[PDB]
Symmetry: D2
Subunit: 475 residues, 4 copies
C-alpha cells in the first residue's frame, strides 16, 4: 500500500520541520517539502498536525500471570490498545519462575504473541534465578533469539529476587554477551520486613503498599545496583523510577560518568500516592504498583523534570491491568493485591499533556522519551523512532489541538479503571500507521491479529556499548 | 564544484552509519550507501575515516584588542587555523567599551572579518553597559543584523562588568527580542578585591590569577545569574565553565528545570592549574585566562564528564592568543597579564583525544559537543552541524587512526605557545570542506580571503525558546 | 539577699540531664547538687517531676520598633513580660537606624526606651543599613564602648536597608577586625524588588503575594552569596530567619567545607507552612506575613526542625514583632505595604518543645541548646547565662515537660490580634520563671517592676567563633 | 589518699576554656576553681601556660588481637602504656569472635588478657560476626551482665566477619531492644571480594591493590545501605573508619534528614593520603595498609578533618593495631594477605592537635569533643569521664599546646617498625598524664603497675542517642 502524509510538520527528537512523508511497502521512501508521487496512494491530510515516530513502550505485561492474577489484556488487545494510543512498538516481559527455563518461557511467550500481535514487538527475559544453566540460556537467547535485554529484581524476596552475589554474576554475564541489564531497584529484605511490620501494625488497605516501602528503600537499592554494575562494567538500566531520592542517586551516578540508563512510568511521572488514601478501596487499589506512587506532592513534577532533563531517558506504561475483582484478592491483605496498572493507551497523550503542554519539555524531547531513546537502546535506531527514508513506516499523525477527555468507559485497554479519569488531553493520535499500513483512523481501529512481527534485537547496542568498550581501554 | 566522499562512516550526533556523501554547489545533495553520480567530481577516499560535520567554535576572539593587547590572529589566520583544525564555523566576539555603540562596534567588526574570513562566521555582541540607547541597539542588531546572542560579564569591574540591576534588565531585554544571554560568571567585586589583596600579599606571578579568584567566586556568580535569569524568564548560557563547584550549580539548576545552557573551553576540559606554577614565567603566563584553570587535579576529568553528560553542552576554544612579549606587560603585576589562550586549531583533536579516545564519550557525543548543539542554539540546525541532504557542505573527513603530536613549532594558529605541547593525538582532520569546497587536504591549506560568509542568525532559537514560551503559559 | 531553693528537679543543660537541686542567692546560682545543706529563710520551689532549664534567650525581638510605617504593638515592658511568662529570661533587641543616619544615636534612642521599662536582662543588635567610613567609626565605638558585638545587615529592602556587595565586603571586613558577629538577612533584594512589582502588575495583591514575589531561590542565592563574601573577608557570618530547604542546604554545604557560618531560624519557620497565606480571611493570611515568608512546600517546617536538631541551624528565635490587623490592613489593597511582623515571644519555648522535643526531632538537651545555650555562647555570655551551674546568673526556669495548655490569642500576654499557633495543643509550660535570682512568674501570676532588668554589655571576639578564625588566618 | 593539685592551668572542656586549678583526691576530681583553698601534702603540678584537658578516650584499639593470621604487636600493657604517654587515659578494646563461636567466651578470653595487664581504664566492643538466635541471647547477656553496650559489625570480610542484610536487620533490631550501639564497618563485602580477585587476576599484587580493589564507591554504598537498614529497624548506627568523601557525604545527608547516625574516623584517615601505597619501599607502602584504605584523592584527609570539626564525624580514634614488617610481609606476593593494621595509639592526640587545631580546622574545645567527650557521652560515661568537673574521674592530662616534638618510630613506645607520621613536626604534647588520680607519666617518664587500670562497665541506653529515639517511636 502506498501512503502519503501531506502537509504535516515532521517532528523527530532533533528538530521539527514542514515535510511530507511518502510510504511504500512498510518503509518510509521519501521525506521532503513537496513530493512527486505516482498516484493511487492513500492521501492523509496532516495539515496542522505533527508527524511523529510511532511510540515505543519499553515495558508491557500482556498475557502475564503475576501474583496469581493474569493480566486482563492479551497480546492482541494490548497491541491494539497501544496503536489507538499512538504506540507502534511494545516490548514484552517474560518472567520465568525460579528454577525454570528462560528459553522455554521465551518460547511460550513467543507462542502467545506471534499469532496475536497487531504491531511490531520484542521481549525482555527475566532472570529470576542463577545457576550455570541460566548463564547458558542467556547466551542462547542473545545469540539467536533476538534478545538483548534481561530484567532482574531486587525485591520479591523468595519469588524473583536476586542476591548481590547473583546480580554481580548476572551483570557480568550481560556485559559479556552485550545485553542491557534492566533492574527494578527496591531493597527486597526491607520490603519483606516492612510489609509484615505493616500488616502486624494492623495496616491492610492499599496505603500499606506505600508505608511498607518508603522511598529510602528505592534510593538504597538503586545506589547499590549502580555500584555493582559499575564494578562489573555492565550498563545498568533502572525501571519504574518512582522517587526524588532514587532520581537523585541516578543523577549523581550519571555525572560521575557511570553508564546508567533509566526509565520511569507514566503514572510515576504524573500522579501522586494520595490516591492510596481515596475513600473507595477499589479506587485506591487501582493505583497499586511498585515502586508505589509517592505521597510527596512534588515527586511527579520532579520526575517529569528529570525526564525532560535525560536523567530519566524513557517513559513507559508498565501496562499490566487487573480487574477490581482480581485486585480484591487482597481486600483484607494489601501484600496480596497484585501489582499492576493500566496505561498502554494513555502513555502518549498523558505524557504530551503533562510534559509538553505543561511546559516541562518541547515536542522534540517528547519524541525522545517516547520513541527515540527506546529505539537507540533496543538497537533499532533509526529503523524505528525516527521519520527518515529507509525507516520502518511506524508513523503517527499526532493532533496537538485535540479534545479527548480520558475515561474508562471509552478506553480500549484493559481494566475497570483509568488512573487518568477525567483528565483533559490535547494530545491525540488521529492516524496510526504500523508497518506502512493504516491501523487506526477516524477513531476506527482496523487490523488483523498477527500482522505485527517480532523484531529480533541486536546485541551490543551502539548507544551504550561503544563508549564502554573504549573506556575499558583506559580502564 | 562537485565532491564525492566515498567509503566513509558518516557520524552525526544521533548515529554512525556507512554512507557516501555527494556535494554540489555548497550543499550536501545526497547521503546514501552507493551513489549514482555524474562524473568529473572530485573523489575523496574516505575509507576507514569518519565523515563528521565541520566543527563550530562558539567563542573566538580574532582581531580583538583586550587588556591593551591585540589578538595575534586576525580573521584570516584565525579562520584558516580553524579549518586546518577541523572547524568550519567560528563565532566572533564583539566587545564594545562602556558608553560606546554596539552597532558601531558590530560594523567595525564586520568590516574586519568579511573581506578576510575563510569559513562561515557569526558574532556575539557584548553588552558592557546599560542605558536606553543600548536596549535600542540590541533590538536593531537582532531585528536586522543577524545577531541572536549577547555576551555579558559579571567581572571586569569598571570595564565590562554589569550590576545585578542591569543584568536583570539586560536579560529581560534579551528574552523579549528572542536572544541568548551568554554570561561569564565570576563575582567581579570579589575578583577586584582578591586581586589587590594578592598583589598586597606580594603575589605577582601568574599563579595569582588563581589565588585571587578561587572557584567559590565562580560558583557564586553562576548561581546568581541563573536565579536572575530564571526570574526574568531568559535563557542563560554560561561561558568558560571552569570548576567543579560551578559545574554542580549548573547541574542542580538544570534538574530543577531551569533553562540553563552551558559551555566550557578545551583548556578547562583538559588541563590543570598546576601550569601556573611551572618554573618558566612565560610558560605559566601562556595559560593565563579566566576563569583560571583550577589547581584541583580532578577538575578537568569532571568537566569532561559533564560535557559527555550534557551538563555542559558545548566545547569552544575561546581563542585569543597573545605573544609572550605581549603577556610580559604583566611580568611584575599578574593583573596586567592579558587573558587569552591559543586553541582554535587544537579543539577538535584535543577533545577527540581526551573525550573520545579517553572513553568519556562516544564519537556521536563528540559531534554533539563540537558542532551540533552549537548549531541548534545558533539556530542553524541542521543547515550546519549535521550531514544530511540540504545541509551546508561544511564537512570534515576525520581520521580516527592518526599520528600527529601537537607542537607550537608546527601550528598555524597564533601564539608562542601551545597549551598541549607534546600531546599525542589520534584525531586529525585529513580533509576540510567548507561551503562545498576543499580548503585543506594532504596537510595543505588552500583558500582565498573572504570566501567565507557572515551567516545571519535567526532570533528565538527553537531549541531553547519553544519550551520557554509554552512553560510561561502555566507560568 | 533573696534566697531561692529549687528542690527535686532534674537540671537540664545542653550537655546532660541530672537530678539536682539549685540554690540561688543574690542573682547568682550558688550551688547545684543532689542534696543541698543550705541556710534557711529561703523560698522553696517544689520542682519534683519538672526540668530546671536555663532561662530562654531570644536572639531576635523587635520591641518598640517602628518598621514599614507601623509601630510594634509590644513596648519593652510588655515584651519582656511576655517573654518571662513564656519561659524566656533574656531578649536581644534590634536597632534599625535609617540610611545616612547614626548607629550610635539609634542605639541610644533604643537604650532610652528599654532601660527604664525592661523586666528581664537584654542586649541589642545594631543594624548597619548603610556604609561610609563614618559607619565604620561608629561600629568601632559601639563594640569598644557600648557592649555591642553583633550587627544586623540586610540584602533586601532595596532603597531602605539593603547593602550592595561592595558594601557587605567592607562591612564584614569591619566586623571581623573589631571581633563582631555579622547577622545577615539573606534575600536577593534586586530580585525581591522586581518580583514584588511584577506580582502587583500581574494583579496579585493578597497576602499570598509575599510568597509569589520572593520564592525560595532568592533566599538560597543571597545566602550562598553572603557566605562567599564572608569567607573571603574571613568574617563569621550568621544567617537570620532561614526560611527554606534551599537556603538550608546552602548553609549545610558551606558548613561542611569548614566555612565559619552560623545560622538561626524562627519559631514560625520551624513549625508552620505557607498555606496560611491562602486562608479565606485576609486578616488571618496577613497575620503570618513576615520575611522570608513561610514556604508553601509541606516539608519545609519539618526539614528546618531537623536541621535545628542537627546544628545546621544553631538557634531558634521569635523575631517577635506583632502588629494589629488594623495596622496590617495598611496593605489590604497592596501586599508590599503589609508590614513584616509576627507575634511569637511568648510561644517560642512551648511551641518549640512540642514540635521539636515531644515530636521526637531532638532531645531535651538540644532543646536547651537551641533555645538558650548556643545563643549565650555566641553573644559571649556563656556560661554566665544559658547554663545552670554555680557562678551563673540566676536566669532559671522551672519547666513542666508534661502539662498541656492550648494556645489561644484570647489568653496571651504578648501583642497581636492573632496567634500563629491558635488551637495548638502544646506540651511544655513554664511553671516558674526566675530572672536575676527573683521569681517573676509563678502560679500563672506575673509580678515584676519596670526597669528591674539590665542591659548586659556583650564582649567582642566571642570564643566560640573567633578562636578558630584567629588560628586560621594566623597561618594562610 | 593520693592528692594532686594542678596549679595555673587553663581548663579546657568541650563547651569552654577557663582559667582554673584542679584538685584531685582518691581518683576523683574534688574541686575546680580559680584559686583553691586545699589541705597540703599534695603533689603540685605547675600547669602554667598549659591546658588541663580530659584524658583522651580511644574508641578503637586492638591490643592483643590476632587478625588475619598475625597478632598485634602491643599487648594490653604496652598498649595502655603507649596510650598514656600519648595523652590517652581510656581505651576501648575490640573483641572479634569467629563465626559460629561464642561472644561471651570471646569477651571473657579478652577480659582475661587485659584485666591483669592494663595501665588505664578500659572497656570493650564485642563483634557480632554471625547470627542465630543464640547470638541474640549472648548479646542480651553481655549488655545485662557484662558492661557491654556497643557491638561491632562488618559488611565486608566475606566468609569471615561479614553479615548479610537479613542478618544486620535482625542484629540492629536486637541492639535497639537492649539499648546498645551498633558499630558498623561499612564496605560492600561482595564487591570487595570480587574486586580483590579481579585485581590479583589483573596481576596487581603490591600494597596499592588495597586501594584499587575497594574504591570509595564501595564504602559510600554500604554506608548508605546500613543507614537505611538502621533507620528501618530504629537502631542507632555508628560508622567506623570513615575513609572517604563519598561516604562522608552519605553520612552528612542522612544526618540532615534526622536519621540517628553517629560516626567515627581514624587519625590516619583524617590526616594522610593513599599516595603512600605507591611509595618505592614495599615495607613503607605496607605500613599504611588498613581498611577502608587511605584514599588517593588529595582532598580527602582535609575534608574528613572538616567533617570532624563539623560533627558530621563525631569521634576520632587510633584503630591501633600494629604489625611488624616481617608480619606484614606475609602478603609480599599477595596484597589480600597483608594484615589490616596501623600503629597510632600514641600519636592520636598530638597528630590531631596539629592538623586539627594548629591547622585552624577546629578550636581546642572541639578537639576535646572529638578526642574524649563525645566518646564519653556515647559510651555512657559522661561526665564521669571526658570532662574536668568535680565528681569526675581523675583521668586528666596536662597538655602543652606549644611544645614541638618531631614524630619518629625510633622514639615511640607503641608497637610497629613504622610510624605513619615519621618526621611530622607536631605541636601538642602531654607533659603529665594522670589516670585514676595518679600520675602515670611525667617528665617524659612512665611509671605504672600492670593491672592498675580497671574495666569500666558501660551502661545500656546511652542518653545522648536513645532519649530522642524512644520519644520518636513512642509516637509513630
Ligand atoms: Zn567474563
Ligand atoms: Zn484518587
Ligand atoms: Zn518586556
Ligand atoms: Zn606546564
Ligand atoms: Zn583589616
Ligand atoms: Zn491558616
Ligand atoms: Zn523488638
Ligand atoms: Zn609514604
Amino acid at each position: 500500500v502506498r501512503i502519503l502524509i501531506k502537509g504535516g510538520k515532521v517532528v523527530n527528537d532533533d528538530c521539527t520541520h514542514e515535510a511530507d512523508v511518502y510510504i511504500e511497502n512498510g518503509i518510509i521512501q521519501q521525506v521532503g517539502r513537496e513530493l512527486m508521487i505516482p498516484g493511487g496512494a492513500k492521501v492523509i491530510d496532516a495539515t496542522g498536525k505533527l508527524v511523529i515516530p510511532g511510540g515505543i513502550d519499553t515495558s508491557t505485561h500482556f498475557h502475564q500471570t503475576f501474583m496469581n492474577a493474569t493480566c486482563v489484556d492479551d497480546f492482541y488487545h494490548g497491541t491494539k490498545a497501544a496503536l489507538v494510543g499512538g504506540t507502534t512498538m511494545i516490548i514484552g516481559h517474560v518472567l520465568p519462575d525460579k528454577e525454570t527455563s528462560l528459553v522455554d518461557a521465551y518460547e511460550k511467550c513467543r507462542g502467545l504473541a506471534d499469532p496475536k500481535v497487531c504491531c511490531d514487538y520484542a521481549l525482555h527475559v527475566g532472570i529470576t534465578w542463577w545457576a550455570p544453566k541460566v548463564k547458558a540460556e542467556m547466551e542462547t537467547l542473545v545469540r539467536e533469539k533476538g534478545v538483548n535485554s534481561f530484567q532482574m529484581f531486587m525485591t520479591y524476596k523468595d519469588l524473583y529476587m536476586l542476591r548481590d552475589s547473583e546480580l554481580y554474576q548476572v551483570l557480568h554475564a550481560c556485559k559479556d554477551i552485550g545485553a542491557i541489564a534492566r533492574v527494578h531497584a527496591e531493597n527486597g529484605e526491607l520490603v519483606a520486613e516492612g510489609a509484615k511490620e505493616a500488616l502486624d501494625l494492623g495496616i491492610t488497605g492499599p496505603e500499606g503498599i506505600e508505608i511498607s516501602r518508603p522511598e529510602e528503600l528505592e534510593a538504597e537499592a538503586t545506589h547499590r545496583v549502580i555500584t555493582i554494575a559499575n564494578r562489573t562494567h555492565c550498563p545498568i538500566y533502572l525501571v519504574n523510577v518512582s522517587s526524588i531520592s532514587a532520581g537523585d542517586v541516578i543523577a549523581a551516578a550519571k555525572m560521575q560518568g557511570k553508564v546508567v540508563l533509566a526509565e520511569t512510568t507514566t503514572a510515576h511521572a504524573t500522579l501522586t500516592g494520595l490516591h492510596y488514601y481515596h475513600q473507595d478501596w477499589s479506587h485506591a487499589a487501582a493505583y497499586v504498583t511498585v515502586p508505589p506512587l509517592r505521597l510527596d506532592t512534588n515527586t511527579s513534577t520532579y520526575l517529569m523534570s528529570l525526564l525532560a532533563n535525560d536523567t530519566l531517558n524513557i517513559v513507559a506504561s508498565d501496562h499490566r491491568p487487573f480487574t477490581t475483582k482480581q485486585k480484591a484478592m487482597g481486600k483484607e491483605d494489601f501484600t496480596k493485591i497484585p501489582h499492576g496498572v493500566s496505561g498502554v493507551q494513555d502513555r502518549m497523550s498523558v505524557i504530551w499533556e503533562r510534559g509538553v503542554v505543561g511546559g516541562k519539555m518541547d515536542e522534540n524531547r517528547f519524541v525522545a522519551v517516547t520513541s527515540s531513546n527506546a529505539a537507540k537502546l533496543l538497537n533499532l535506531y533509526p529503523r524505528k523512532g525516527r521519520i527518515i527514508p529507509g525507516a520502518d513506516a511506524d508513523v503517527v499523525v499526532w493532533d496537538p489541538e485535540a479534545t479527548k477527555t480520558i475515561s474508562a468507559s471509552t478506553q480500549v485497554q484493559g481494566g475497570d479503571f483509568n488512573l487518568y479519569e477525567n483528565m483533559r488531553c490535547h494530545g491525540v493520535p488521529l492516524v496510526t500507521i504500523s508497518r506502512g499500513r493504516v491501523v487506526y483512523e477516524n477513531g476506527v481501529f482496523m487490523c488483523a491479529e498477527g500482522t505485527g512481527k517480532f523484531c529480533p534485537l541486536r546485541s551490543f547496542p551502539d548507544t551504550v556499548y561503544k563508549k564502554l568498550v573504549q573506556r575499558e581501554k583506559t580502564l
